[PDB]
Design an enzyme around this catalytic site. Structure first.
Site, PDB file in Angstrom:
ATOM      1  N   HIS A  15      45.726   0.392  12.632  1.00  0.00           N
ATOM      2  CA  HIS A  15      44.251   0.435  12.583  1.00  0.00           C
ATOM      3  C   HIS A  15      43.786   1.608  13.640  1.00  0.00           C
ATOM      4  O   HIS A  15      44.485   2.285  14.300  1.00  0.00           O
ATOM      5  CB  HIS A  15      43.538  -1.018  12.825  1.00  0.00           C
ATOM      6  N   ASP A  37      36.298   4.408  13.901  1.00  0.00           N
ATOM      7  CA  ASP A  37      35.518   5.739  13.423  1.00  0.00           C
ATOM      8  C   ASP A  37      33.906   5.069  13.950  1.00  0.00           C
ATOM      9  O   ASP A  37      33.388   4.194  13.075  1.00  0.00           O
ATOM     10  CB  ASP A  37      35.533   6.320  12.214  1.00  0.00           C
ATOM     11  N   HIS A  86      30.183   5.914  13.800  1.00  0.00           N
ATOM     12  CA  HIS A  86      29.058   7.160  13.235  1.00  0.00           C
ATOM     13  C   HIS A  86      28.247   7.210  14.480  1.00  0.00           C
ATOM     14  O   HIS A  86      27.601   8.417  14.372  1.00  0.00           O
ATOM     15  CB  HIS A  86      28.518   6.732  12.112  1.00  0.00           C
ATOM     16  N   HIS A 117      33.850   1.738  11.504  1.00  0.00           N
ATOM     17  CA  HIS A 117      34.635   1.273  10.540  1.00  0.00           C
ATOM     18  C   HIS A 117      35.916   1.757  10.892  1.00  0.00           C
ATOM     19  O   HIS A 117      36.255   2.791  11.389  1.00  0.00           O
ATOM     20  CB  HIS A 117      33.982   1.634   9.265  1.00  0.00           C
ATOM     21  N   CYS A 118      36.927   0.888  10.369  1.00  0.00           N
ATOM     22  CA  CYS A 118      38.355   1.480  10.467  1.00  0.00           C
ATOM     23  C   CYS A 118      38.613   2.595   9.471  1.00  0.00           C
ATOM     24  O   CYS A 118      38.041   2.630   8.552  1.00  0.00           O
ATOM     25  CB  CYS A 118      39.374   0.197  10.357  1.00  0.00           C
ATOM     26  N   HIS A 166      41.048  -0.283   4.181  1.00  0.00           N
ATOM     27  CA  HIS A 166      40.753  -0.827   5.282  1.00  0.00           C
ATOM     28  C   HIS A 166      39.231  -1.342   5.230  1.00  0.00           C
ATOM     29  O   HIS A 166      38.896  -2.303   5.626  1.00  0.00           O
ATOM     30  CB  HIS A 166      41.223  -0.148   6.668  1.00  0.00           C
ATOM     31  N   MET A 206      36.671  -4.272   7.297  1.00  0.00           N
ATOM     32  CA  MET A 206      36.707  -3.654   8.786  1.00  0.00           C
ATOM     33  C   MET A 206      35.532  -2.447   8.919  1.00  0.00           C
ATOM     34  O   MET A 206      35.563  -1.285   9.061  1.00  0.00           O
ATOM     35  CB  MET A 206      37.936  -2.808   9.057  1.00  0.00           C
ATOM     36  N   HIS A 211      15.795  -6.426   0.249  1.00  0.00           N
ATOM     37  CA  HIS A 211      14.363  -7.168  -0.155  1.00  0.00           C
ATOM     38  C   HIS A 211      14.407  -8.494   0.212  1.00  0.00           C
ATOM     39  O   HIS A 211      15.250  -9.253   0.148  1.00  0.00           O
ATOM     40  CB  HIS A 211      14.246  -7.144  -1.899  1.00  0.00           C
ATOM     41  N   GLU A 226       8.472  -3.038  -0.173  1.00  0.00           N
ATOM     42  CA  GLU A 226       9.036  -4.091  -0.867  1.00  0.00           C
ATOM     43  C   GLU A 226      10.541  -4.233  -0.721  1.00  0.00           C
ATOM     44  O   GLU A 226      10.930  -5.288  -0.966  1.00  0.00           O
ATOM     45  CB  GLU A 226       8.397  -4.149  -2.438  1.00  0.00           C
ATOM     46  N   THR A 227      11.105  -3.056  -1.215  1.00  0.00           N
ATOM     47  CA  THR A 227      12.460  -2.918  -1.043  1.00  0.00           C
ATOM     48  C   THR A 227      12.993  -1.741  -0.566  1.00  0.00           C
ATOM     49  O   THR A 227      12.233  -0.497  -0.753  1.00  0.00           O
ATOM     50  CB  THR A 227      13.101  -3.222  -2.554  1.00  0.00           C
ATOM     51  N   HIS A 257      18.423  -6.170  -4.193  1.00  0.00           N
ATOM     52  CA  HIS A 257      17.511  -6.139  -5.442  1.00  0.00           C
ATOM     53  C   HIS A 257      18.135  -5.584  -6.511  1.00  0.00           C
ATOM     54  O   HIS A 257      17.290  -5.243  -7.740  1.00  0.00           O
ATOM     55  CB  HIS A 257      16.097  -5.972  -5.297  1.00  0.00           C
TER      56      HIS A 257
END
Ligand SMILES: [Cu+2]
Ligand SMILES: [Cu+2]
Ligand SMILES: [Cu+2]
Ligand SMILES: [Cu+2]
Ligand SMILES: [Cu+2]
Ligand SMILES: [Cu+2]
Lengths: 336, 336, 336
Positions: free
Chosen positions: B89, B92, B94, B129-130, B139, B144, B249, B273-274, B300
């Site tokens: 494993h 990463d 971001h 994330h992996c 993964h 992950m 939502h 709303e969304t 939604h």
């Protein structure tokens, strides 16, 4: 001004992923900028196991070349459909106003050409694509799209009106492909473009691509063909998707300033991890490199990227910066 | 400042959907904030009919815990891969700059750990994330991922620069799952993680999830495990999706202020709303509750929510407000 | 103000794609605006080869009619479920606060009606849809959604606060349909609504629509039923999608000012080629026509548009403008 009275200039196009030389901010007044593109239908190998596409291109490439003008210029395109092709074609410029983007004025059968002028009165990156009546999605998904970039006459600006400048531009076109299989589970290879049509439409209607590629092939922007840059360089990454949504991301980087809807009169967003290109549009991101190494630039549906093809590389030269990132302890046995 | 000379602090992580205690606006200067996570591979029951997932987690949970720092801090993570796991494993971030987000500096085989530092120089919610070479999407889709939240040092702000403050934060990770079926139409149960690989990749490539869950299971955030709040309380709802788009939502509510792209130096949008979380990102919404009752918080695409699992509940105490909403006439026979 | 003491007004609704008469900017103070809708379950022909849908509608149409109020008004809806229908229904207003959008206060069995009031305290276009417990997506995808537009009391504004005004509004509801097939490869025709349920849920769970239509049918907004305008006219295009993302585009035009998330207190974006409506929302675009001809308005996933149905026409009268676009050379033989 009346375009019939303006100066004309001719541009020589270049193949993706490069972009033809151009000014950002300019002192020039408005011009009629002349371009030519020649349609090429051709069979292309699109993956590492020999799968072929009965493809359709502007100027021999997927995407077609990027055309660059300034706001207030006129685009004057000669579109050529040689007699060696089988299908009619045309062009729809999303940067243009009227006549289905120009498609109604540019219907060319094999053996014909046409010339279209339009005012580039709106700044941004805009898709162009083929759109012949009765077979619009087929021509798009087979390869016929690219980008028109209309720069503001004084160059790109941040939300406060400060100037933004890039050292290099790259153009990435992302293509959702619909390659049919036969009853033996193998992808089909067709002798002619027309023979591929009915089977392809059935795959299209499932809305599940067989492949999703940058620039015409799995791995097109890797190896010898990786994008390149240096620490300290600012790059503009133009991303077009004429048919289907995508979500660009630079692994180990960011979008410093991003116009995800692609229209430069709107303020950009900063510090993006992942941005969103709506199917039927082009967007643009600026990034200044701060670390050397081989980056990936990809669609962050990681299945679409790593399994289906929507990923490339950027090889960056320069000095590593331990303030931004440092390995404090290398992988080693867990302390006991 | 040079991080080698800065004060260090250690944070104790907590399990989702809670978020570890933290300040919003702070008087503190920059610090190196130390965290530890331990990878756990485990079989998990993910629905109400006994379907299992051969899962992979940071710290035993889907999503992994949320890490909170302030802009200008350094994140210093020790990543542990115990010898009881089968796979290599890495991580990463971001939020980080360089070396594939840190993945190239954190490759840990079973029995190994590593320690990574990076500058959190950009405010926002960011996915981590992996991403092991050659098996990245597997993964991620097996569990992950989680969120790094980098708060501005003076807390969250509206488009005019007015302070925004929350009373409670919750973290929701949404997971598109690809569970294989056998020829009898039943979901497969695997004795080991490695045995699940080839069948799962084939399901992945269809781009159709079998299940889409919040926080590890259908109904995870319901019943005893519903989220809670009170009328008058302001909540921050952090939403991560490392692989696939979603559209959050709040039924009967709104996003009062929303950063859908998740980056706090950009002005938020109001009255949504969304909203839209791009696959490969985390976003955040503020809402102040004005009505009591049991709300749903969901994706939604209502098929993805109600049929496939992407829905939870928020149970809210307090006084009903007839100015905002009133039943004028209860259901009764149609007048004749 | 207390709504019990405010003036009441009644509005007569009109069928899509029109919108009932209303003011943009108004001198009026807040009012309780009264509406009535009657649910109709009915079998509908949805394509050109005779395929039927066991449909469910507000007021006999897909979408339901658009309701228009001003910020600070109260919406007071009487919802009628006649005894000739088979299923229970209700309504969830995304513009409303509390009780699952009003759904918990509006559960009407066949033979019943109810009346709901809520404060329209947030400006924008908002979806409304049916949402009965245990069968929410079925009712939505079978046709039960439309738009509530809450205008600012002083009308629409650009990012600088300048007034925007439209001459005509049109409402487009886009419906992802899930029509089952039998083992002979033909779409199924059902004698009753209840008989269609189990087969439809299985299609839904594949997340692949059989059809994607505007306003109830393939080609609904074409031929005699095309939208209309004139050169010089400004139109508001309201677009709702209660279940699934879409990406509107005007071929040969633009979105001059667009609220893609649909909420008018946020500044709009300009010059859009293609915008994005999140599933579970409504958005709005302004455009001033500058060229005559027959435009297409479509979802720019071109497969979804041209193969599955998500496309309409706008027929525009007036004078052609050669400054915006000119055919310099008509299609003719390639020079030799
Ligand atoms: Cu073509
Ligand atoms: Cu187009
Ligand atoms: Cu892993
Ligand atoms: Cu990533
Ligand atoms: Cu209903
Ligand atoms: Cu809803």
């Amino acid at each position: 001004q009346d375009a019939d009275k303006l100066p004309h200039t001719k541009v020589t196009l270049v193949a993706p992923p490069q972009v033809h030389p151009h000014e950002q901010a300019t002192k020039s007044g408005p011009k009629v900028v002349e371009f030519t593109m020649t349609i090429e239908e051709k069979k292309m190998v699109i993956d590492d196991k020999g799968t072929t596409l009965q493809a359709m291109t502007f100027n021999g490439s997927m995407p077609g070349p990027t055309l660059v003008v300034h706001e207030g210029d006129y685009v004057q395109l000669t579109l050529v459909n040689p007699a060696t092709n089988a299908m009619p074609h045309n062009v729809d410029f999303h940067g243009a106003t009227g006549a289905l983007g120009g498609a109604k004025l540019t219907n060319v059968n094999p053996g014909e050409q046409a010339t279209l002028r339009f005012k580039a009165d709106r700044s941004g990156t805009f898709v162009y694509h083929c759109a012949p009546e009765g077979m619009v999605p087929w021509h798009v998904v087979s390869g016929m799209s690219g980008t028109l970039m209309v720069l503001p006459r004084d160059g790109l600006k941040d939300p406060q009106g400060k100037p933004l400048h890039y050292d290099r531009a790259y153009t990435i076109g992302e293509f959702d492909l619909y390659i049919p299989k036969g009853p033996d589970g193998k992808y089909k290879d067709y002798a002619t473009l027309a023979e591929s049509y009915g089977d392809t439409v059935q795959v299209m209607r499932t809305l599940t691509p067989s492949h999703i590629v940058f620039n015409g092939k799995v791995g097109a922007l890797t190896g010898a063909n990786a994008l390149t840059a240096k620490v300290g360089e600012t790059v503009l990454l133009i991303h077009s998707q004429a048919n289907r949504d995508t979500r660009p991301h630079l692994i180990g980087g960011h979008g410093d300033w991003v116009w995800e809807t692609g229209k430069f009169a709107n303020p950009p967003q900063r510090d993006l991890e992942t941005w969103f290109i709506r199917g039927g549009s082009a967007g643009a991101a600026l990034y200044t490199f701060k670390q050397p190494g081989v980056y990936a630039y990809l669609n962050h549906n990681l299945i679409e990227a790593f399994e289906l093809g929507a990923a490339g590389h950027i090889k960056v030269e320069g000095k590593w910066n331990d303030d931004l990132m440092k390995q404090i302890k290398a992988p080693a046995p867990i302390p006991r």
